[PDB]
Amino acid sequence: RPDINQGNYLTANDVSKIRVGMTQQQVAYALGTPLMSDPFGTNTWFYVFRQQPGHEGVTQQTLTLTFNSSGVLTNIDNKPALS
Amino acid sequence: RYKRQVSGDEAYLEAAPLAELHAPAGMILPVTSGDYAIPVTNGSGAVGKALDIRPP
Amino acid sequence: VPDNPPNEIYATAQQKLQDGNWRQAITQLEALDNRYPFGPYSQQVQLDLIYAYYKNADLPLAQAAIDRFIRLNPTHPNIDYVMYMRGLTNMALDDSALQGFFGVDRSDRDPQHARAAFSDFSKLVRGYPNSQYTTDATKRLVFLKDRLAKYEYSVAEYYTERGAWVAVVNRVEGMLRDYPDTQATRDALPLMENAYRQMQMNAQAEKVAKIIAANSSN
Amino acid sequence: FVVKDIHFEGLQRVAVGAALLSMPVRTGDTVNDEDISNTIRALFATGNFEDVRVLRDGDTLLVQVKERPTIASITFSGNKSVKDDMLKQNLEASGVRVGESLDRTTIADIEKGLEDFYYSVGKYSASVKAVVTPLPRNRVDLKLVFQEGVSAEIQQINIVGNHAFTTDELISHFQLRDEVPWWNVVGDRKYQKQKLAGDLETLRSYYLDRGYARFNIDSTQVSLTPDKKGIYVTVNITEGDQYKLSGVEVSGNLAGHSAEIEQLTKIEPGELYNGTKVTKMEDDIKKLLGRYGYAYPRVQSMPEINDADKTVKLRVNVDAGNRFYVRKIRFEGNDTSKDAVLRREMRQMEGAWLGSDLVDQGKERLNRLGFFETVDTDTQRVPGSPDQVDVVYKVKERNTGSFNFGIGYGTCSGVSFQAGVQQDNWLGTGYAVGINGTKNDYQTYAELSVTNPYFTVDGVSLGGRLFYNDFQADDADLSDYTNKSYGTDVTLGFPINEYNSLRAGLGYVHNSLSNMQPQVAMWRYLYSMGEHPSTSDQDNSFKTDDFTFNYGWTYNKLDRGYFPTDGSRVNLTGKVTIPGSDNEYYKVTLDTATYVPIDDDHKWVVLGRTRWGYGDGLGGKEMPFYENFYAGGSSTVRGFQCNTIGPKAVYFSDDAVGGNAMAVASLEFITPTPFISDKYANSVRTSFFWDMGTVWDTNWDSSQYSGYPDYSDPSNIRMSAGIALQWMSPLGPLVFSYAQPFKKYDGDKAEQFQFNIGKTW
Amino acid sequence: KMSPLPTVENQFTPTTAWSTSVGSGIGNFYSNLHPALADNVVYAADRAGLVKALNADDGKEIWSVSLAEKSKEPALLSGGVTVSGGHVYIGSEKAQVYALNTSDGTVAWQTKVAGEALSRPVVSDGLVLIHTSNGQLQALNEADGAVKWTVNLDMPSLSLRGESAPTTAFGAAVVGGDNGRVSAVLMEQGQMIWQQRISQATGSTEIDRLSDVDTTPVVVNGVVFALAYNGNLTALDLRSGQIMWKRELGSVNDFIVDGNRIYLVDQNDRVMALTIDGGVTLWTQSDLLHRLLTSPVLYNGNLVVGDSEGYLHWINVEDGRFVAQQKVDSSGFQTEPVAADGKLLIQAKDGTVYSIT
């Protein structure tokens, strides 16, 4: 019976390197790319740590970010765990 | 051998339409490459099977 | 395999063509090449060979012939014939009815051939918008458009039934960036509507609500 | 001078205007005094005029000029290990091909270039010559006469500076052989420039792992006779002294995986430096870092020597590349096969992180199903991307169905026509069916079977089966009574582990028996059920219809299907009666085989094959005989006939009958075939075999018919051995075999040459 | 391919003194090794390890010995055959060099070099001069084999045999070597006095470049002559090597010059007489072609060699007309006879000597 991962990896101390007023490229060197990214305006990005192994057991973290026209931050949202 | 019928191509087999897409109120559609697209043109003369290939 | 001056040989070439005979004209034309590889009407010979390869359907030989020709003859007015015929080749290369007996969907197979066809017809228009080859070529491009769409739609179905809730959407953003048409695309947004809610992304689900509500009945 | 016009004669392939242009002088102007020189240098710069002859009348220039004749056909005479295509390639490298004119004098230099190629082979005494054929229309044919002479062997392979450790026999590890045993005869001694280069590094590799770190080469020298018959080769080296290592360390970025690499670098103290151990260790690290999700790091291995104690400290350095993820997947090969079909064997998923290991599990799962002929993986880097990555899985398809043809070969369907067809990739979908229709003009037997292995996701399997059957042959009144019967099977199937599978299902049958012989073992059953209508009767008749249950167990671990090379595949089935039914019994069959190579490199391989069979009734009652086992037919037991094995019945002697006890195996030696090239050598398999089998019954006794033999014994063993050719062809698998039996008994029969067409390993 | 035999003839008896079956032979292998005389004796051996010591008039053994790698691995002796001062100085395949005494088969010393221990060693005031396939030229002692100096030279990727026939004058020492280059040098540090090229670089490294290896020159009088295969037969200065003339010709084996004439062969095995100071062929004989033949000598006023068919190719000196003929052995030959001062002889591939009348 099967197993799945999906999402972007995390270091979880990378998180301790995140300050607003930082170019998107700094986070690029920090993380590598995102994969989900708003194709409806509002320059923003997404980052998730989902996995579904086992017959049971489910998990997902998330951080969700929005930036200026400058490619520099405006605000974040850590949803550390789903509900 | 030397005569077969598992392939009989050079047939027009289409009928398909086309449609184009509006936008919403307010927020925005996603952008386009233009790499795959239709430079529009007046169609006319020969078409379909009613058509020539007998070369020049 | 006689040896003669080329006039009678091209004569019988025309004859065997009018006969619908390939296997004779084939070797006739190969000998016309080899015996007179730089004749004064060599170009017509190349044309007739590719016509032969179509009417007998030895396809990749024809592909090689066409790219040979366009390499060596870059410029002459009948070039449109060449480009169109190339695209027709690859269009055939996709299709078949070895399985078709009124019931098959040919979709959901290796599509790259169609992409080559797409590029080919497109190029030929973009160099030669005005010919007598186009009124159907446009529609055939539309066919390939729909097919490339359906290809991705079907992949979406499987991944969705697993619940690859995100890689799907990464496909679909490209489906949008390429394909603003094809009801399948309009029929595929609801997959996102399920997806983002499986993600517990609410704040984009309303975007999905707007776009669906923005559109009328598919 | 004063010329006003020019006329040319003897040009049939070129314009006169270009001719008179190549010289500065022209018609309609005062020509110069260099006109002769201009005609010369131009008409011989063209390379298309063999000779010119120009004269001036006083007002007009007459040119009498030929054109160099052009080659029509380039032909070859004397080819013995050499193919004309490569020679025409060498000509186009020369700058010469059909439909080109020439001097007819570089023929010597042409011959020399050809002879240089011949040198490149390893023949140097040869001699080549041209044959020119002049032909009208300014044409020629050309033919090539060869005398290849002969190549050399090698006479001695003697080595310098190799003292204190011999290899002058251990050299035998090379590609090359300076000794051909008359008791191990194959091939011969031949030189090559590059096989040399390989065995040199091979020798280096040898010395690199017995405790040396400076085994260097000075030079390599070769010569041979003036008569060019045998070669003398020598090589110049050092041998330093022995060596050791002293500790090991690393350096570089990780994600705190220091404790794991610690295990791969792990050693005992005081051991010999190697370099192959080193290399596999590096690659093992690369595998681990594949698993944690890295592709492109860098790795360096530096010896820090102290020759003062003949030790090294191996410095190591890694640069973990920046992380990757995947973006996309694409597939090529699929013309007759749908998408979404192969992703359901990708234990990798798209659009997320990555290992290097799911990939190979997918390769395995794919090559199992035999829906493809061959496979290729690859891994790119996306343009404008440090971290985004894609993948490709390419394949070559295969047509894999069949067309079975039973004729009752060996008389298990007697004189009959069993037609039918099977395909497991039906119409390119994941869908599988099989059918037979069987006719004799009095006999019927039709059957359908079907399965979707992917009814539901995650490998959920669902199958059905049906059969109708009428048998009418007792107007022969010889044996094998008349039966009519029909029924159904249904089945679920599913896995639990990622290799091992289960299934189970049900069935219902309906049976009608008529014109029973007075055969003797039957009345055993007929007491077991109940009534006994014997005297010698042939109005005898009976009916019974029954429900039933079955189940299956599966261990499948192979490189692939479709002529595998490695692992093993085993399947067990247990079938059983159920209550509320006309009877009670249960049987079990197991089929086993396992592939083991030498190295899977040249494919010198062995298989082992075995089967087990057992069953028994209930309530002190026996099971029916039509569900008995059988054997023979030259698919399970090679060199024997269909259902012609084992015990047999009588009335008050022949015609074996089947039973309930089986034990059978066959042990093989797998072979390649050198007489065919790869093009089909991938798709053919030959072997020898040695086959054993025996049979009995537990219910059978000997206290009453003891003047007739035992059939209860597991003794009386059937033994044979033989050879088999196996080859694929568009109608299905195909196989022949010829054997020689060496343990028969009475009551039995067989054939030597046999044929099969279906699915049997 | 290979020419047929001519008729036997006479005008001199085909004469044979004794012969002896001697050693286990050496076999198909090309080498350069053939016996060497001393007072009332000649000597030879095999590659296997086994060595003799004989008479001059009976050919019986005053004694014989053998050696091997101590066990008892192949000895592989293919050096030269030479004596000096009651001592013998020989080489192997192995860069291992063997110094025995003449009075007994016992070691003076044994030593080591680089590169194969090939062709005929030569010695003068002591001071032996040795050469290999490596293109390395060592210079050697007399009672320990100690080196005094050594030279490096370019070598190709391909050859026929790196060989050498070094020769000396006034304590000034000369030899060829591959690449058609020749060097005339010292005897003290052996360092370069000068060099000279004569070959032609025209082929594709396997047509020319077959004249690379140099078999043998020799001196006459302030002048030397030389050659290589499909090369130029030369006339060069003792002091400088500068050219006096050349002849586009070829061979591989050694020559000889006595009288006002010079006597040598073709790679296709044809023989001739050319002038002392020119190269003007007075005559040739061209009969015995592709016969794998060996260089001649003079004996009582004419020339002979032997062949792979094992025969004798006697001639007239003045025109080369065949004067005599003998079948003597079925094993053919590979290498060269000699004679001296009353006594003529030859060895077989297969372990057989002939002593000659």
Tell me the nearest-neighbour CA distance from C130 into chain D, angstroms: 34
d(CA D711, CA D719): 17
DSSP class of residue A23 equals B
Instruction: Please name the member of C179, C183, C207 whose beta carbon is closest to the beta carbon of B27.
Output: C207
**Record: contact C139-B9, CB cut-off 8 A:** no
Give the closest-approach CA distance of D350 to chain C in angstroms: 6
For this entry, resolution in Å reads 4.8
Residue type, D640: F
Place of tokens 């799945």: A4
**Do A41 and B28 count as a contact with CB atoms less than 8 A apart?**
yes
Q: Which of C10, C101, C139 to mutate to test the interface with B (most CBs of B within 10 A)?
A: C139
C-beta separation of E354 from E19 below 8 A? yes
E200 strand-pairing partners: none
CB C171 within 8 A of CB C155: yes
Q: Give the gap in angstroms from C-alpha A16 to the nearest C-alpha of chain B.
A: 33
**Which run of H or E residues covers position A64?**
strand A62-67
Instruction: Dump strand ranges (E) for D532-604.
Output: 541-558, 567-577, 585-597
Phi-psi map region of D199: left, alpha, beta (phi>0 left; psi -120 to 50 alpha):
alpha
Tokens of E232: 């130029």
Full strand arrangement of the beta sheet holding D52-56: D5-9, D60-65, D52-56
Q: Could you tell me if E165 and E210 are in contact, meaning their C-beta atoms sit under 8 angstroms apart?
A: no
- Helix axes C79-94 and C112-127, enclosed angle (nearest 10): 160
Question: How close is the nearest chain D Cα to the Cα of C216, in Å?
Answer: 31
The CA-CA-CA angle for residues E63, E69, E71, to 5°, reads 110
Cβ contacts below 8 Å, chain C against chain D, sum to 57
Q: Which amino acid is located at D260 in the chain?
A: E
In chain D the first and final C-alpha atoms are separated, in Å, by 93
Beta pairing class for D153-157 and D230-237: parallel
Distance of CA D686 to CAs D136, D451, D735, E200, E229, Å?
56, 32, 9, 58, 54
Asked if the C-beta of D227 comes within 8 angstroms of chain E's C-beta atoms, the answer is yes
CA–chain centroid gap for D339, Å, is 25
A41–B27 CB contact, under 8 Å: yes
Q: Which of D666, D628, D675, D635 is nearest to D760 (CA)?
A: D635
Q: Do chains E and C touch (3 or more CB pairs under 8 A)?
A: no
Q: By what method was this entry solved?
A: cryo-EM
Chain B positions in Cβ-Cβ contact with residue A41 (cut-off 8 Å)? 27-28
Structure token pair of residue D567: 């692992």
∠ CA C96-D369-D435, nearest 5°, is: 70
Question: HEC profile for D368-409?
Answer: HHCCEEEEEEEECCCCCCCCCCEEEEEEEECCCCCCEEECCC
For residues A7 and A50, the answer to whether their CB atoms sit within 8 Å is yes
Indicate the residue of A7, A11, A33 with minimum beta-carbon distance to D352: A7
D335 closest CB neighbour out of C110, C155, C162 = C110
- Supply the DSSP string of D435-504, one letter for each residue: EEEEE-SS-EEEEEEEEEEEEETTTEEEEEEEEEEE---TTS-SSS-EEEEEEEEEEEEEESSSSEEEEE
CA distance C46 to C66: 9
CA dihedral D41, D43, D48, D50 (to 10 degrees): -90
C31 touches chain D (CB under 8 A): no
Say how many C-beta atoms besides its own lie within 10 A of residue D89's C-beta. Answer: 11
Residue D531 neighbours by CB under 8 Å, 6+ apart: none
Q: Which of D50, D54, D47 is nearest to D67 (CA)?
A: D50
DSSP three-state, residue D41: helix
Nearest beta carbon to residue A33 from set D347, D388, D495: D388
Least CA distance to B31: which residue of chain A?
A39
Cβ-in-10-Å burial (0-12, 13-18, 19+) of D95 comes to exposed
Q: In chain A, which residue's Cα lies nearest the Cα of B27?
A: A40
Range of the domain at A48: 5-83
State the architecture of C1-218 in CATH terms: Alpha Horseshoe (1.25)
**What is the 3-state secondary structure of chain C?**
CCCCCHHHHHHHHHHHHHCCCCHHHHHHHHHHHHHCCCCCCHHHHHHHHHHHHHHHCCHHHHHHHHHHHHHHCCCCCCHHHHHHHHHHHHHHHHCCCCCCCCCCCCCCCCCHHHHHHHHHHHHHHHHCCCCCCCCCHHHHHHHHHHHHHHHHHHHHHHHHHHCCCCHHHHHHHHHHHHCCCCHHHHCCHHHHHHHHHHCCCCCCHHHHHHHHHHCCCC
Looking at residue D427, the DSSP 8-state letter turns out to be G
> Measured between beta carbons, which residues in chain D are less than 8 angstroms from residue E93?
156, 158
- Interface check for B26 against chain A (CB to CB < 8 A): the answer is no
Would you tell me how many other CB atoms lie within 10 Å of the CB of residue D592?
A: 16
Q: Helices C42-56 & C23-35, crossing angle to 10 degrees? A: 150
Helix axes C6-18, C23-35, angle to 10 degrees: 160
Question: D306: helix, coil or strand?
Answer: strand
CA distances from E83 to D343, D418, E109, E166 (A): 84, 93, 14, 16
Task: Report d(CA C194, CA C200) in Å as an integer.
Answer: 10
Residue C158, chain D, CB below 8 Å: the answer is yes
Contact state of C200 with A83 under an 8 Å Cβ cutoff? yes
Edge-to-edge strand list for the sheet holding D70-77:
D70-77, D139-147, D127-135
| Cβ contact D352–A8 (<8 Å) | yes
Q: How many domains does chain A have?
A: 1
Q: How far is residue D423's CA from residue D402's CA, in Å, rounded to a whole number?
A: 7
Taking the C-alpha atoms of residue D573 and residue D504, their distance in angstroms, rounded to an integer, is 9
Q: Are strands D311-319 and D248-249 parallel, antiparallel or unpaired?
A: parallel
Task: Report the domain count for chain E.
Answer: 1
Q: Do A40 and B28 touch (CB under 8 A)?
A: yes
- Residue D519 and residue D479: Cα distance in Å, rounded? 9
CATH number at residue A34: 3.30.1450.10
Q: State the pairing for strand pair D139-147/D70-77.
A: parallel
The Cα–Cα gap between D525 and D626 comes to 11
- Work out the number of other CB atoms within 10 angstroms of the CB of residue E32: 19
3-state secondary structure labels for all residues of E268-279: CCCEEEEECCCC
Give the residue numbers spanning the domain of E295: 1-357
Domains in chain D: ranges and CATH: 5-65 (3.10.20.310), 70-147 (3.10.20.310), 153-237 (3.10.20.310), 248-319 (3.10.20.310), 328-397 (3.10.20.310), 399-470 (no CATH), 472-595+609-627 (2.40.160.50), 635-761 (no CATH)
User: Is the CB of E93 inside 8 Å of chain D's CB atoms?
Assistant: yes
